[PDB]
């Protein structure tokens, strides 16, 4: 077949971008077979599907005595766009370089005989987080929500600071944060990032982009990306978790429910005993209602329209760790 030239060409450009990012000093990627991955996925459509997005579909699968999380890419939606293929190889190589953390989804390799490199990861047990919580047939407690918060926070700080040249991926949603057996929040699909060059912390992103609702409208109206373009949208990645209300919220009429506007008006109207995802309210609410108040005031502080009032990712992760002190 033409699987061999698939493998040769995409391995060529994969190695080129691999060494261009990190000097050819990779992490031990292993290779899988087409037969192995097709017997894992059972020809790509079943209940083994978990999550949809624009480019990629997150499946379950099973190689010999070992289940896995699998990600393919859309063949039809990518191949006519040079910026999209330059994007998707940045995705796979930056995730492959990103395996050196225990809060990111560890990469385990990729198969290359396809139009695009479908790739395996570490098997998280529970499925993809939806826009509220778990997706398998069941609700999840409160302390695990706080753990999800702090681990999302320090993972994004790693993305912000861990290098000479810093990278920004423009969208943190609860549709991405996968979740294991031992209830850790392994973020994944570092897949809309740009690497802005050395020293300067402000560059003109020529495409404003990424998951409407979490846009930070100052960036949307000024068309350049900053440090703070993630520290906004992490806030309404936290608010979504702690109220359980999706971003495109409707009440019987034309979805006109701005989440920030509702919580900001309810801050001085309902006085904070209304924002706590009410089906959770069989919680004991002993002192953790105060830490609920602390994280909602952190979220509304980190999302206002004057960016220099916003803390950085390091500050929000540090005090998000600090509000563990109810123990």
């Amino acid at each position: 077949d033409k699987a061999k030239r698939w493998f040769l060409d995409n391995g060529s450009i994969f190695l080129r971008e691999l060494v261009a990012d990190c000097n050819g000093k990779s992490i031990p990627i292993r290779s899988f077979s087409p037969e192995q991955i097709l017997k894992a996925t059972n020809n790509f459509d079943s209940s083994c599907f978990v999550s949809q997005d624009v480019y990629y579909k997150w499946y379950r699968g099973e190689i010999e005595d070992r289940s896995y999380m699998i990600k393919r890419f859309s063949e039809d939606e990518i191949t006519g766009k040079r910026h999209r293929v330059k994007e998707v190889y940045n995705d796979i190589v930056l995730s492959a370089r990103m395996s050196n953390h225990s809060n990111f989804l560890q990469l385990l390799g990729c198969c290359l005989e396809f139009p695009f490199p479908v790739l395996v990861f570490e098997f998280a047990e529970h499925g993809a987080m939806n826009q509220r919580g778990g997706v398998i047939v069941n609700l999840l407690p409160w302390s695990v929500r706080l753990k999800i918060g702090k681990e999302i926070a320090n993972a994004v700080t790693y993305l912000h600071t861990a290098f000479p040249k810093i990278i920004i991926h423009r969208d943190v949603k609860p549709m991405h944060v996968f979740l294991d057996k031992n209830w850790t929040a392994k973020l994944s699909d570092l897949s809309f990032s740009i690497s802005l060059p050395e020293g300067k912390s402000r560059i003109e992103a020529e495409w404003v982009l990424g998951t409407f609702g979490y846009i930070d409208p100052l960036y949307h109206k000024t068309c350049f990306v900053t440090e703070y373009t993630d520290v906004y949208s992490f806030g309404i990645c936290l608010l979504v978790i702690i109220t359980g209300k999706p971003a495109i919220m409707t009440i019987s009429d034309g979805d006109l429910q701005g989440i920030l506007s509702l919580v900001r008006e309810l801050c001085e109207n309902g006085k904070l005993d209304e924002v706590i995802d009410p089906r959770l309210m069989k919680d004991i609410t002993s002192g953790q209602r105060l830490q609920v108040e602390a994280c909602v005031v952190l979220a509304l502080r980190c999302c206002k329209e004057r960016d220099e009032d916003r803390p950085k990712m390091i500050q929000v992760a540090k005090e998000l760790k600090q509000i563990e002190a109810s123990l």
Binding site: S12, L15, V19, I29, R30, N100, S102, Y158, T161
Partner: protein, 816 residues
């Protein structure tokens, strides 16, 4: 440079004369009376080499002597693998015996008056002023003399556009001018000016906008509120414009108080062409006779901390430094040259005259620096005198890795060994001597302090380019060269097979890949004697198994290494009948579906490195059958009745570094758990437990005891939650370095510390990116009394540590 080829020839004959296999042969008598008069030649070939300078009559024939030595070496290595009628060499040996002596006799008065260097063993790290920060006090003194002058202009002219701009950021954030002082501006004006970031940038730190506006109103807007107050200005990259326009800017700002502008350029249009408060244009490249000579002693002596314990030598040191008049890397090069001898005054005066006569006829500003270091070059020991000049085969400031050129050296034989100290203890030794002589400098270290990448300077790389030009060494624009090196799209002329061609090395500026077609792959095996071969950072449009299937005809290989190369699905099937191949390395190469069995059927190789290769059939069977394996890392112990094992490595003794991955249950075997207690000189092990699901693995690896002697322990993924219950002072006394990369572990059991009478006695520690650790720093001190430093960069729940944010940013924390 022929002192290198005669020395490697003499050691090669000394090693090959003890074969004792062919006796009725006059060439086995001829080697002794090659060796004897070669020893006689080695009396005076150093003076012959330095007399080749400025005398054309010596280089007309000594190059033919050199290629004669080269072809004699090639035919004697041809005599090694003969296995038959090797009698067609004796008349040729008689021929060049008759050819040698008419070069021997005319050299009878040109002097008329041991490949082991001795100083390569102590490495001294003479970058103590490299990283120039010794100018802060005098720059601060220049800041303090603003009001004593009228309007200070601090022109750092001369060198510029090279990266010196970090000499002023410590002035930007010092202590004295941040309390009683107002603030200081910053500009970023490169060779582009754009008429928008010149004079508006010094105001836009207060809120000036980018509106279409003339020069005049902002010039009367900025510089007004400065009645008797100290202030700082900066400028960068001046030319004629913003010098015939800046004259109303800097005289448009007020006076009577000082006012210090600092200009940092490569051009010199401000320090001299207007000459206004440029009485401090005395740049630290030039120094006083007691600003330069003390650091010259710090470089050259460096053993009693840069002192003249014989003050007789102070006079010749003073006369040398006043002849080179204090230009920095010249005194650095002659300092690194003057490490070795330090014995007696007459050789110092001899090399002082060697400095004197070459500077007697140069007469320029930049030929002095060039020819000052060439006399440092030819006064090396002989064996490394050609290994220094291989890194002329590189671009201008690429950051060269050690595991390319050291492997190339030990491949084609520039390093020699006879007695125990085999491979890396010699190669790193001669490289460390070369960096003692200040030719090659470190760029990056590790936690442990081993060296990785090293760079050169421009005004020595042009010199060694010239030495390569005048000795038929490289630059194949002109075919007759020694050995080739390829970088990005440069042999698209397809530089053909010459027979000289000792080897080839890929080179790369850390961030590119030289693509290459399939035709030059055939042009590789078109050659015959290609001792070193490495095509590292390159990609091909054809797999290597079908394009490197013409290699078994060669047989004169010591070095191949195919690291970071994608179309290498299978190692070549024709790797049966070749026997030397001293090193092999496919480092970080990900797609190797099998490792061929027949590679175990030769008993000579030294380095076997298959590191971080996940997809693998993980070894053949009989890998304990070799004896001379000293670093073999990336082991992957195989399955039960499959491949290699762990017990069968017990047949080895020679190891220094190994590395192994542990995934399933059946890599290790329960009776093989004690297979590595009695290894003698094994020095530094490695473990990367990356894909580790099976929970029995932590339960059953925990009694794999190492040898008690070891130097660098590095286990790096390690899926267990506790320590492996053998890391202890009770089990291993003389470790020095320890590193734990990304793991999930929780805590360590108490025999890890074991501090009744038993302590770790290690020196460097790394705990890099591991999220579930909980220890105390004072417990670490009171359990380990010796630490140079301990680095850690991504590890929360560890705020007991001393570095300022242990979760996020790595403080190194050396011990003072």
């Amino acid at each position: 440079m022929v002192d290198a080829v005669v020395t490697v020839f003499l050691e090669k004959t000394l090693n090959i004369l003890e074969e004792k296999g062919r006796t009725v042969s006059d060439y086995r008598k001829q080697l002794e009376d090659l060796q004897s008069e070669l020893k006689y030649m080695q009396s005076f070939l150093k003076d012959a080499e330095r007399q080749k300078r400025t005398n054309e009559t010596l280089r007309t024939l000594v190059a033919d002597l050199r290629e004669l030595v080269y072809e004699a070496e090639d035919i004697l290595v041809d005599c090694q693998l003969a296995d038959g009628d090797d009698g067609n060499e004796q008349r040729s040996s008689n021929a060049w015996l008759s050819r040698l002596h008419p070069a021997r006799v005319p050299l009878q008065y040109k002097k008329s008056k041991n490949g082991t260097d001795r100083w390569s063993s102590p490495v001294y790290d003479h970058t103590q002023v490299v990283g120039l920060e010794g100018d802060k006090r005098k720059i601060k003194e220049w800041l303090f003399r603003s009001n004593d002058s009228q309007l200070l202009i601090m022109a750092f002219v001369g060198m510029g556009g090279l990266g010196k701009t970090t000499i002023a950021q410590e002035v930007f954030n010092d202590k004295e001018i941040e309390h009683r002082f107002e603030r200081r501006i910053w500009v970023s004006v490169s060779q582009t000016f754009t008429e928008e970031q010149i004079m508006r940038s010094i105001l836009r730190n207060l809120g000036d906008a980018s509106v279409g506006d003339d020069i005049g109103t902002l010039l009367r807007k900025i510089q007004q509120y400065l009645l008797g107050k100290r202030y700082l200005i900066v400028m960068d990259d001046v030319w004629d414009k913003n010098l015939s326009w800046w004259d109303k800017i800097y005289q448009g700002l007020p006076r009577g108080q000082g006012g210090s502008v600092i200009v940092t350029t490569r051009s010199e249009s401000v320090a001299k062409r207007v000459q206004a408060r440029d009485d401090k244009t005395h740049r630290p490249e030039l120094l006083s006779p007691d600003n330069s000579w003390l650091l010259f002693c710090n470089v050259a002596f460096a053993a009693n901390d840069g002192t003249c314990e014989r003050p007789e030598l102070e006079d010749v040191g003073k006369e040398i430094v006043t002849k080179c008049k204090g230009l920095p890397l010249t005194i650095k090069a002659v300092g690194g040259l003057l490490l070795c001898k330090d014995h007696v005054y007459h050789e110092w005066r001899r090399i002082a005259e060697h400095f004197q006569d070459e500077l007697r006829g140069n007469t320029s500003e930049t030929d002095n620096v060039m020819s000052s270091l060439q006399l440092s070059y030819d006064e090396l020991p002989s064996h490394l005198k050609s290994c220094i000049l291989t890194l002329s085969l590189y671009p201008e400031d690429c950051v060269i890795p050690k595991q390319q050129l050291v492997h190339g050296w030990i491949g084609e034989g520039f390093v020699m060994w006879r007695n125990g100290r085999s491979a890396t203890e010699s190669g790193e030794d001669c490289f460390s001597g070369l960096t003692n002589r200040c030719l090659i400098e470190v760029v990056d270290k590790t936690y442990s302090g081993t060296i990785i990448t090293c760079k050169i300077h421009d005004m020595v790389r042009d010199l060694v380019i010239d030495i390569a030009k005048k000795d038929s060494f490289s630059n194949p624009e002109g075919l007759n060269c020694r050995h080739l090196g390829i970088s990005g799209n440069f042999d698209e002329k397809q530089i053909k097979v010459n027979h000289k061609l000792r080897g080839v090395v890929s080179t790369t500026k850390t961030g590119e890949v030289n693509k290459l077609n399939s035709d030059l792959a055939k042009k590789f095996t078109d050659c015959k004697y290609l001792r070193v071969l490495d095509i590292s950072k390159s990609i091909f449009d054809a797999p290597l198994s079908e394009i490197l299937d013409e290699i078994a005809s060669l047989q004169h290989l010591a070095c191949l290494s195919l690291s970071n190369t994608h179309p290498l699905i299978q190692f070549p099937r024709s790797m049966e009948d070749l026997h030397n191949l001293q090193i092999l390395d496919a480092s970080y190469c990900q797609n190797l579906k099998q490792l061929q069995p027949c590679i175990v059927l030769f008993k000579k190789l030294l380095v076997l490195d298959m590191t971080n290769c996940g997809s693998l059939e993980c070894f053949p069977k009989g890998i304990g059958s070799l004896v001379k394996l000293e670093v073999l890392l990336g082991f992957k112990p195989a399955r039960s009745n499959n491949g290699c094992k762990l017990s069968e490595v017990k047949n080895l003794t020679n190891l220094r570094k190994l590395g192994l991955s542990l995934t399933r249950g059946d890599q290790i075997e329960e009776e093989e758990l004690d297979s590595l207690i009695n290894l003698s000189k094994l020095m530094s092990i490695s473990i990367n437990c990356y894909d580790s699901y099976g929970d029995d693995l932590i339960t059953k690896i925990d009694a794999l005891t190492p040898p008690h002697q070891l130097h660098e322990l590095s286990l790096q993924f390690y899926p267990g939650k506790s320590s492996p219950s053998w890391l202890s002072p009770h089990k291993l006394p003389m470790l020095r370095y320890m590193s734990i990369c990304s793991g999930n572990l929780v805590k360590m059991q108490e025999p890890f510390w074991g501090n009744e009478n038993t302590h770790w006695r290690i020196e460097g520690l790394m705990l890099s990116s591991l999220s579930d650790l909980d220890m105390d720093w004072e417990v670490l001190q009171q359990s380990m009394p010796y630490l140079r430093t301990v680095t850690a960069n991504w590890c929360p729940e560890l705020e007991s540590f001393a570095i300022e944010d242990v979760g996020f940013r790595g403080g190194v924390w050396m011990k003072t």
